[PDB]
Design a protein around this ligand. Structure first.
Ligand SMILES: [K+]
Ligand SMILES: [K+]
Ligand SMILES: [K+]
Ligand SMILES: [K+]
Ligand SMILES: [K+]
Ligand SMILES: [K+]
Ligand SMILES: [Mg+2]
Ligand SMILES: [Mg+2]
Ligand SMILES: [Mg+2]
Ligand SMILES: [Mg+2]
Ligand SMILES: [Mg+2]
Ligand SMILES: [Mg+2]
Ligand SMILES: [Mg+2]
Ligand SMILES: [Mg+2]
Ligand SMILES: [Mg+2]
Ligand SMILES: [Mg+2]
Ligand SMILES: [Mg+2]
Ligand SMILES: [Mg+2]
Ligand SMILES: [Mg+2]
Ligand SMILES: [Mg+2]
Ligand SMILES: [Mg+2]
Ligand SMILES: [Mg+2]
Ligand SMILES: [Mg+2]
Ligand SMILES: [Mg+2]
Ligand SMILES: [Mg+2]
Ligand SMILES: [Mg+2]
Ligand SMILES: [Mg+2]
Lengths: 327, 567, 128, 49, 132, 15, 50, 101, 81
RNA sequence: GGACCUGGCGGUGCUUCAUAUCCCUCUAGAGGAGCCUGUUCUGUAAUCGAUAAACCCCGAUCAACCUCACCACCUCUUGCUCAGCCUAUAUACCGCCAUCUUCAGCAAACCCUGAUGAAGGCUACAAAGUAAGCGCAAGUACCCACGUAAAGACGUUAGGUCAAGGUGUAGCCCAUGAGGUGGCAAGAAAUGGGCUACAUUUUCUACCCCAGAAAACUACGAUAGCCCUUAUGAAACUUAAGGGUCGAAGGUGGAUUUAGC
């Protein structure tokens, strides 16, 4: 016997969590759950996971930017990654007849879908999407290739085009994930009333570093006051006044509303832009829903995200680089 | 906030590896920590220049180095006073001699301040970090005193107090005569010491000693000196020798304190408690002395007045155990828990003695449901138990018929340093195996006996031969059978022959019942073979049982015939 | 300066020069090589040149049931301790110098013919 | 005060209470250089005399 | 290539702690600070002095508990209190740890003129986050 | 290679 | 304790500064650091000195 | 025990500048006004020029306290860029992090 | 007595356990300031407090009786000074 | 010498590409002038390092003394240090980085093919590969999920740094160490980067965008030169600011070349 440096694979190996381990981790979580409830003077019976997270954030305050790195006291089911069960018994016989494919769960699904397509022959969008590969890989609890995912989707689509019945429709919906779309419909500000009873709306707008707050009155003669000044005295530049005109002109309401707005920060153009957005948002309270959608599609209700880019070190500007020295 | 019962005292490091697991480690861990502090102070004071940068605001005087050396090198009176404050006995004497030879005048106040230093330490140097009678016959104190030109009352008083402190009782009484011949008046502190010398100077009968003391007290009244607490405390402390003779005289001192206006301290009652607590039947007198002393002390907060105040609670609990009075023990503990009275418990040795006698009295005279509440409140939070209290606790569980707690007492016993105590493991095993129990309990007793077996196998005396008592082996084997772990029990039978320990009759009979259930004739013969080796009388009768009960093969029959030949 | 000092790991990583263009392509050959030595190996916490005896750190805390006090070894008693540590260092070096020499192969510098021992035991408790 | 820090920790090393890994490293390099013949000369007795 | 405080990939046999496994850009994102004091806050003074003290204490504890430290020190300052929190191994006898705690707390209290406490947490072995 | 072949019980409160 | 208290969060301050990345040359390569100071303001009213 | 001889010279310059600060402050006050006679200010000019050269505070250099690097030092921590980064990059400087924005 | 974990987990791993967890040691925890403790602490501190004058109901009433305002600031920092 | 493999290379084939990108296209520049600054060369008794891309307002978020490591002269010798050395070696190194990277690959442990040769290992209606880990990705920071930062493995250039500090080896120890005084750093010239200009979309003033004048030898144009004052300092023809005086080249710049979605 000669001592070739002995090998140890277990060092870098992963730590699999046996089912007995999880069973004892849950006993600790239930005892700790009652301890934590006793610490905070709350009833242990009605102590929820939201209360645990709130109590842990107080007792162990962490400012780490990444939430996953902060203290956590969760149920082991949530913490520990799901573990694939034994795939054979004591006699060594695998449970599933497709074990030796190495992908028994995936190929069993292809077998079940292929079998349904056969029976149909013997017998004979907007709100939903197909699940992604990372969601299929969790239903099956296996690792999948990209082409494996495509083959499964191509086989489901081939099943919808057929005259699939109710039994063949509950199955496909297991792999359709509803896509919840946020509405682009603009939110309308409430219509308020002043001491004199004149209806008005109020909104806010931001352009670069300029911040504006505008009060649009339901009825008026077209007067606009900016920090108490006539708009043409506050904005001597003709382009800044055209920006103030743009919202009212677009909906054919020049000379129909009075506006009193306040703006701070930014330059002359950014201030006119911020007022344009504030007036447009407030003006949406006095127009029809169809007119509000036209203003949205005209770019009058979107906050401009274009702000100055920081300079980086080692270059002259935000993008400009120093001269590449002559070689 | 109250004491945390799951924790060890705050002084220890709150870590499972660093927490003390025994009363021995409780004492030694603190001594190791104090040693580290002393080594730091030794370095701080030896190399003060490294620790002289003061960045603290406000200044912290107690975090600066200490300078124990005199900084005045001139020979004069003002330089001697410095060496007296630093308590330099040799340097101060040398400086005093040189100063005297030169002929310069040394004030009286300073000459006395030099005697106070020599008379207190006995012409010896006080202990430092690193460099019988003790009234040395050749002592600077007596010499300087004789050479002294003018001697005041204070000069004699410090000589009389120093002699008595160092056990020169006879010299101090002789010096007390000169003070009177010189028409001087002593102070109360001198009288306190002379009372100590009157009793300890010579051994005589009580009546002779009690007549001298009353003469010192009357002298103290002639000289217009008022007695203090230590005057009466010294009388009671010195009467401890005479015991029964001093019982009524001692109570006359206490009644005098109350009238005069001096208030008895905890030490005043400690001395009376010890005086009345002589070996014998305490019921005759000690009963009503402790009952009356506690009614007086009920609901009183105490302040330190005498050095012996930290001995009352240890003394009072000692009698409550002797009388076996649990109601009185609660009153003593109640007094210890009022206000800040808990600080008079005493050093670690006195704290462990107090709680041992207190808890051992609870286990004895208190209900088991309350006993286990004190067990949780006191151990290890207040003290670590001695192995004899674990036994007193098991005896309390036995008397209450609550034996499901035995496995917990063993688990705790290990955590307190009693894993390898023989008297304890024998006690646990005997109680567990004394009688049969339901299957659920019997299984638990077999898991504990297994852990005990491991303790016997992995003793630290494993370097030497392993000592397996006979009772321990019999009990551990019986517990395995009754639990159904017959395989483990059969294996252990070898250890009876290896260590030559007699098997118990009950163990042999239960082994047969495990064989007849398994219908194994060889094992049944193995039992008869074991009892035959020791020549037990039950064997010859057991062989008859084996014949009928089990089918005997010709080889087995000859084997029994071989044992029959031995018969 | 105390603050310019580094740890032993930093000092050995630098001194050994195992990472570098020399060690990348074996551009440097090593007939003479700096060998790493653990200098904390035979060192006892609490033991210094002055020979102080710290109770509870390098000597027992209690002696004859009483707590020991700070003490210092005599000049003669300390030389023996120092000498004993030097001999223990050469003895340890002698233990490393004593390595059992293995049989050679077809020739002294040849690998051919040398035994490598039995193959490693397989994962399923297989042995060879 | 670099004197205080260096002098304090040097003293603590001689007392056995501080292990200076850097100093130990230097002491081993200096020890092995004597065995190699590369010892520091006596002041005034340098290679040039 | 960036080098600062990066344990480089090896053969999968090098155990690294959580702190050692995170490069500097993860500071304040995945790993916290090893010392907490007020000197680096806006409008606060004496950052230079707190920094020198911290560098010393790390060297002092490394050499005072040689071979015992299983992770970097966590230094906490509240008022004038200095708390040193160390993760140590379970090889030295408890007596030697109590000696060094008493010794270190006292020596550091007189050196920096402030009450110093040392808190020891023992682990059986260096806690391994991953094998690089 | 040829020159040289290259070169439990835990209890509480131990004394 | 019966004290009237209001709370608000003043705006945070981030102090940034730049340092060279290399020990020697390579000027155009820098490392940038920041110190973030966050604020909370407790405003108590109508309380005695005790 | 200072890092180098150059740090040791700056230590002495800082100690001597501290000892002469009051003397130099008082003499400079006589030179920094148009009230006193020139005959008196000319004598004060000679007096401050006769003080030791290393008493002048303009000769003090802010060197790295751990490496004595004379440039690239951050005054707030008194450390060179290299030493500061070493401590900052190991999370040993309270509240300091890499800046991304 | 809490099974609290902290640390960014490795792939298919879990946040590190509390034993030997330096990230939890770095946190200024509030275990000594639980709501139960704070309420008990403040019950003991009520004996130290005094009652604001009821007559001074509004700031305008304070200004009438106490026209002078004195502002001073105390600074709490960590360190020896 | 034969055959074959790998690499390198080809004034080597074909194919598809680069998105501020190789060419053209778009905008503002550099290349010409003065000035500022770096380097080279020359000069000087008088540092060093960087020095194709990936050096050249680079180590320096910075040199009148100091800094300083250089030169000349003088002085000290167990020396601020249980010495010291900015002495040699970055081709011994740690530490921290450049570079491809404006990449996506590296890879332990196994398995199989080639007769068990150097070698090779992919086809999805799939034919021998499985792969921990690392990187990318994800996540986080900044104002979003966008963008910008940050991140960016292994390897390439014995790439940069012994003068950040530390340190292997070699060398110095009345000197290659330490201190003091004074001094060097100029420009025949060449060149890189930048600033200011050559003007009318300009110049001056008011104003901060509805004005009045200026507008070619008293215009535009020096942040230069010269003189004075002030600021900092112990020290200023020297550094900085301001004023005065002066009013030059320059009239929008060849080959070539830089940056930006
Ligand atoms: K080729
Ligand atoms: K040009
Ligand atoms: K390198
Ligand atoms: K170096
Ligand atoms: K070197
Ligand atoms: K140019
Ligand atoms: Mg630009
Ligand atoms: Mg040979
Ligand atoms: Mg980079
Ligand atoms: Mg300067
Ligand atoms: Mg040009
Ligand atoms: Mg040069
Ligand atoms: Mg060069
Ligand atoms: Mg070079
Ligand atoms: Mg190059
Ligand atoms: Mg000079
Ligand atoms: Mg100079
Ligand atoms: Mg030199
Ligand atoms: Mg290199
Ligand atoms: Mg993004
Ligand atoms: Mg980047
Ligand atoms: Mg990334
Ligand atoms: Mg090179
Ligand atoms: Mg020299
Ligand atoms: Mg000018
Ligand atoms: Mg001046
Ligand atoms: Mg002109």
């Amino acid at each position: 016997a000669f001592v070739i440096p002995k090998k140890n694979v277990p060092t870098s190996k992963r730590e699999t969590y046996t089912e007995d381990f999880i069973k004892k981790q849950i006993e600790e979580f239930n005892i700790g759950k009652r301890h934590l409830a006793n610490m905070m003077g709350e009833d242990p019976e009605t102590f929820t996971q939201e209360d645990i997270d709130r109590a842990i954030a107080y007792l162990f305050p962490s400012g780490l930017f990444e939430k996953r790195a902060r203290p956590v006291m969760k149920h082991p089911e949530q913490i520990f990654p799901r573990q694939r069960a034994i795939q054979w018994g004591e006699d060594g016989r695998p449970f599933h007849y497709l074990f030796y494919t190495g992908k028994q769960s995936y190929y069993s699904l292809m077998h079940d879908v292929y079998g349904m397509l056969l029976n149909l022959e013997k017998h004979q969008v907007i709100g939903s999407r197909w699940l992604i590969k990372e969601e299929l890989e969790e239903m099956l609890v296996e690792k999948l290739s990209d082409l494996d995912y495509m083959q499964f989707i191509r086989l489901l689509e081939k099943l919808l085009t057929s005259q699939c019945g109710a039994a063949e429709e509950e199955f496909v919906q297991r792999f359709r994930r509803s896509v919840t779309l946020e509405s682009k419909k603009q939110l309308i500000e409430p219509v308020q009333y002043d001491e004199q009873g004149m209806a008005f709306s109020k909104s806010e707008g931001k352009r670069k570093t300029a911040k504006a707050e505008a009060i649009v009155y339901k009825h008026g003669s077209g007067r606009i006051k900016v920090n108490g000044i006539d708009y043409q005295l506050y904005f001597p530049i003709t382009q800044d006044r055209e920006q103030l005109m743009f919202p009212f002109h677009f909906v054919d309401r020049l000379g129909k509303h009075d506006v009193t707005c306040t703006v701070s920060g930014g330059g002359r153009s950014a201030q006119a832009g911020a007022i344009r957005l504030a007036m447009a948002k407030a003006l949406c309270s006095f127009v029809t829903e169809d007119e509000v959608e036209w203003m949205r599609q005209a770019g009058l209700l979107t906050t401009d995200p274009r702000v100055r880019e920081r300079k980086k070190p080692g270059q002259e500007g935000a993008r400009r680089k120093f001269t590449w020295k002559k070689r | 906030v109250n004491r945390d019962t799951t924790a060890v005292p705050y002084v220890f490091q709150d870590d499972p590896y660093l927490m003390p697991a025994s009363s021995l480690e409780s004492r030694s861990f603190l001594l190791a920590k104090k040693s580290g502090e002393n080594v730091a102070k030794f370095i701080i004071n030896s190399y003060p220049k490294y620790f002289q940068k003061d960045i603290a605001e406000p200044h912290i005087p107690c975090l600066m180095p200490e300078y124990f050396e005199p900084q005045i090198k001139d020979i004069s009176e003002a330089a001697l006073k410095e060496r007296i404050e630093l308590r330099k006995v040799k340097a101060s004497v040398d400086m005093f001699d040189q100063l005297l030879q030169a002929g310069t005048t040394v004030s009286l106040e300073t000459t006395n301040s030099l005697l106070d230093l020599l008379c207190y330490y006995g012409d010896q140097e006080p202990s430092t970090d690193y460099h019988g009678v003790t009234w040395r016959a050749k002592n600077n104190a007596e010499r300087i005193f004789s050479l002294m030109p003018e001697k005041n009352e204070h000069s004699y008083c410090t000589m009389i107090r120093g002699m008595v402190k160092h056990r020169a009782y006879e010299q101090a009484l002789n010096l007390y005569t000169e003070l009177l011949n010189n028409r001087l008046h002593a102070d109360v502190y001198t009288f306190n010491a002379l009372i100590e010398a009157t009793v300890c100077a010579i051994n005589e009968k009580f009546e002779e000693k009690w007549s001298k003391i009353l003469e010192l007290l009357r002298h103290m009244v002639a000289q217009k000196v008022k007695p203090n607490l230590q005057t009466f405390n010294t009388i009671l402390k010195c009467l401890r020798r005479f015991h029964v003779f001093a019982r009524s005289p001692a109570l006359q001192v206490l009644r005098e304190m109350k009238a005069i206006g001096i208030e008895p301290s905890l030490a005043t009652y400690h001395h009376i408690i010890r005086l009345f607590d002589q070996p014998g039947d305490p019921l005759k007198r000690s009963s009503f002395i402790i009952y009356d002393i506690m009614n007086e002390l009920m609901g009183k907060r105490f302040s330190p007045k005498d050095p012996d105040d930290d001995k009352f609670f240890q003394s009072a609990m000692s009698i409550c155990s002797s009388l076996r009075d649990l109601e009185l023990a609660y009153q003593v503990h109640g007094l210890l828990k009022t206000g800040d009275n808990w600080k008079f418990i005493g050093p670690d040795q006195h704290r462990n003695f107090y709680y041992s006698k207190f808890f051992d009295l609870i286990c004895l005279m208190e209900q088991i449901d309350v006993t286990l509440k004190w067990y949780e409140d006191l151990i290890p939070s207040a003290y670590f138990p001695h192995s004899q209290t674990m036994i007193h606790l098991l005896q309390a569980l036995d008397v209450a018929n609550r034996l499901e707690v035995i496995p917990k007492i063993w688990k705790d016993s290990k955590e307190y340093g009693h894993t390898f105590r023989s008297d304890l493991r024998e006690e646990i095993l005997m109680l567990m195996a004394r009688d049969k129990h339901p299957p659920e309990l019997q299984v638990a007793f077999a898991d504990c006996a297994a852990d005990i077996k491991s303790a016997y196998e992995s003793q630290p005396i494993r370097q030497t031969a392993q000592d397996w008592p006979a009772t321990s082996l019999n009990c551990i084997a019986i517990l395995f059978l009754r639990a159904g772990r017959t395989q483990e029990a059969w294996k252990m039978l070898g250890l009876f022959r290896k260590h030559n320990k007699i098997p118990r009759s009950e163990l042999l009979n239960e082994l047969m019942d495990s064989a007849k259930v398994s219908n194994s004739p060889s094992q049944a013969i193995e039992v008869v073979e074991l009892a035959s080796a020791f020549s037990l009388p039950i064997c010859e009768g057991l062989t008859q049982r084996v014949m009928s009960d089990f089918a005997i093969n010709q080889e087995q029959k000859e084997a029994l015939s071989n044992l029959t030949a031995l018969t | 300066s105390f603050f310019t000092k580094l740890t032993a790991d930093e000092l050995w990583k630098g001194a050994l020069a195992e990472t570098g263009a020399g060690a990348k392509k074996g551009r440097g050959k090593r007939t003479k090589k700096k060998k790493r030595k653990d200098l904390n190996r035979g060192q006892i916490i609490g033991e210094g040149r002055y020979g102080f005896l710290w109770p509870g750190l390098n000597v027992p805390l209690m002696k004859n049931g009483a707590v020991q006090t700070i003490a210092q070894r005599s000049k003669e008693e300390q030389e023996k301790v120092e000498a004993d540590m030097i001999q223990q260092r050469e003895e340890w070096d002698r233990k490393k110098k004593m390595k059992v020499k293995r049989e050679r192969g077809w020739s002294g510098n040849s690998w051919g013919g040398i035994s490598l021992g039995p193959p490693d035991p397989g994962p399923c408790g297989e042995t060879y | 005060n670099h004197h205080t820090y260096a002098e304090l920790m040097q003293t603590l090393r001689f007392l056995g209470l501080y292990r200076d890994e850097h100093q130990d490293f230097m002491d081993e390099q200096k020890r092995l250089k004597k065995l190699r013949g590369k010892e520091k000369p006596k002041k005034g007795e340098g290679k040039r005399a | 290539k960036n080098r600062a405080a990066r344990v480089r990939v090896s053969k999968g046999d090098k155990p690294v702690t959580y702190e050692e496994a995170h490069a500097p850009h993860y500071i304040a994102h995945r790993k916290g600070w090893l010392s907490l004091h007020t000197g680096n806050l806006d409008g606060e003074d004496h950052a230079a002095e707190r920094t020198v003290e911290d560098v010393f204490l790390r060297k002092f504890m490394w050499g005072t508990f040689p071979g015992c430290l299983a992770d970097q020190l966590v230094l906490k300052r509240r008022g004038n209190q200095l708390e040193i929190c160390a993760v140590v191994l379970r090889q030295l006898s408890p007596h030697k740890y109590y000696f060094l705690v008493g010794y270190s707390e006292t020596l550091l209290s007189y050196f920096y003129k402030c009450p110093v406490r040392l808190h020891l947490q023992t682990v059986p072995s260096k806690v391994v986050y991953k094998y690089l | 290679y040829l020159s040289g072949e290259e070169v439990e019980y835990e209890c509480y409160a131990p004394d | 304790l019966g004290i009237s208290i209001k709370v608000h969060e003043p705006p945070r301050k981030i102090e940034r500064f730049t340092l060279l990345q290399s020990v020697h040359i390579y000027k155009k390569h820098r490392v940038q650091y920041e110190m973030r100071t966050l604020y909370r303001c407790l405003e108590l009213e109508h309380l005695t000195g005790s | 025990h200072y890092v180098d001889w150059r740090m040791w010279r700056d230590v002495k310059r800082r100690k001597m500048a501290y000892e002469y600060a009051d003397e130099r402050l008082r003499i400079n006050s006589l030179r920094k006004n148009t009230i006193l006679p020139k005959i008196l200010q000319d004598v004060a000019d000679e007096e401050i020029a006769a003080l030791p050269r290393d008493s002048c505070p303009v000769r003090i250099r802010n060197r790295c306290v751990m490496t004595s690097r004379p440039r690239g030092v951050k005054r707030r921590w008194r450390l060179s860029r290299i030493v500061f980064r070493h401590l900052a990059d190991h999370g040993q400087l309270s509240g300091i992090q890499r800046a991304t924005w | 007595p809490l099974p609290v974990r902290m640390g960014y987990p490795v792939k298919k791993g879990v946040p590190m356990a509390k034993e030997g967890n330096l990230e939890l040691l770095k946190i200024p925890n509030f275990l000594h300031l639980t709501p139960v403790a704070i309420k008990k602490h403040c019950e003991a501190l009520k004996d130290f407090c005094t009652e604001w004058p009821a007559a001074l109901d509004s700031d305008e009433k304070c200004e009438k009786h106490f026209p002078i305002e004195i502002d001073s600031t105390d600074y709490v920092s960590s360190g020896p000074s």
